[PDB]
């Protein structure tokens, strides 16, 4: 799951932005999304959260995982989903 992958999350984020917005609840799948995306960003997602509501926030968190490099944006995405037991997660590829 080298950067390779990394390349298709980030695209397959753009891709899934619909089954996104929707499913995610960026107050949280945020909980471990903080791993690999710095707070500047996650607290971010949960401004938009506040100010905007979850949709929007999940619309630039999807942003924000597009603005990071660590591969763990997208494992940490599923994950703090699979956690929360988000709709998103099922729809969401990762390799794990």
Do not use: H
Not at 2 to 13: H, P
Not at 24 to 44: A, K, W
């Amino acid at each position: 799951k080298k950067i390779e992958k990394l390349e298709e999350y980030r695209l397959l984020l753009k891709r899934l932005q619909p089954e996104f917005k929707t499913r995610i609840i960026p107050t949280d799948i945020i909980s471990d999304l903080s791993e690999c995306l710095i707070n500047q960003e996650c607290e971010e997602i949960l401004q938009i959260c506040s100010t905007k509501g979850m949709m929007a926030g999940a619309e630039k968190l999807v942003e924000c995982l597009l603005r990071s490099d660590k591969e763990n944006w997208p494992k940490t995405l599923k994950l703090a989903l699979e956690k929360e037991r988000n709709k998103f997660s099922e729809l969401w590829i990762v390799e794990k």
